[PDB]
Design a protein around this ligand. Structure first.
Ligand code: 7XL
Ligand code: 7XL
Lengths: 126, 126
């Protein structure tokens, strides 16, 4: 099969930054969205306005998205070990600040099966 | 070809109500979104936070959407005469209130080539 591309998202309100990520991810293979739960999101930022099921109804309908799975924690390891993607895609915002430790763990965990992180310039102004 | 289904949207922030409309519309054929411009939207409600190009980047990436065209006015006639869709889909909110006259004109204009309006229960609570 095609490679598996894992994309973590809160995705409270979809905007062109998200679309950019998904468009870049689709270049790498079939996208599985790791849709973060309330509890995951609450652990590092403000809770979203929309519920998990509401956010899922939107994101599952974005072009390029093959599957959507819950990501119950900010940390990606448990999901990465289950789905074993070839790629993870994220914006470069998480090189600094609250998600940096989670980013480092994505790189180290993916190395276990030779997966790669691909980072995209964050879309400014939105 | 498949039937052409016209769906008017401001689509400032996509939520499951919109997804429902698009999912119902896709049952009828290939979706063309009439994406309303600022000037169109300003004529009957508050201006959106996102620009036309920002809203288009999102909506063009929704599953089932074949084409996106600007709709420069609240009134649908000019676009309907150009695209000549078999169907128009809208929520039933516009049976009452500010869009009711536009709704009536959709029905009458579509009759010119035997197109039909299909209305969907508005998604409450969002
Ligand atoms: N203006 C923006 C806003 C978001 N993004 C990227 O979208 C992706 C999804 O963002 P979000 O839903 O905020 O998810 P995260 O909180 O980063 C999920 C956990 O890593 C992410 O890769 C982010 O860098 C982006 O590239 N540009
Ligand atoms: N909770 C909601 C919100 C919107 N909708 C439907 O989505 C469609 C798009 O809504 P919007 O982007 O607000 O477009 P309109 O301002 O109605 C476009 C001009 O008719 C429309 O058919 C509306 O009835 C819906 O069915 N349920």
């Amino acid at each position: 099969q095609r490679p598996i591309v894992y994309v973590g998202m809160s995705a409270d309100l979809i905007h062109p930054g998200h679309i950019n990520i998904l468009s870049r991810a689709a270049e790498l293979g079939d996208i599985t969205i790791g849709l973060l739960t309330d509890a995951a999101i609450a652990s590092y930022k403000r809770l979203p306005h929309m519920t998990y099921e509401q956010r899922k109804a939107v994101v599952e309908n974005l072009k390029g998205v093959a599957s959507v799975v819950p990501q119950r924690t900010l940390d990606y390891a448990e999901n990465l070990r289950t789905v074993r993607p070839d790629f993870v895609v994220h914006g470069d915002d998480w090189q600094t600040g609250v998600q940096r430790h989670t980013r480092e763990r994505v790189i180290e965990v993916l190395s276990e099966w030779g997966g790669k992180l691909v980072e995209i310039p964050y879309t400014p102004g939105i």
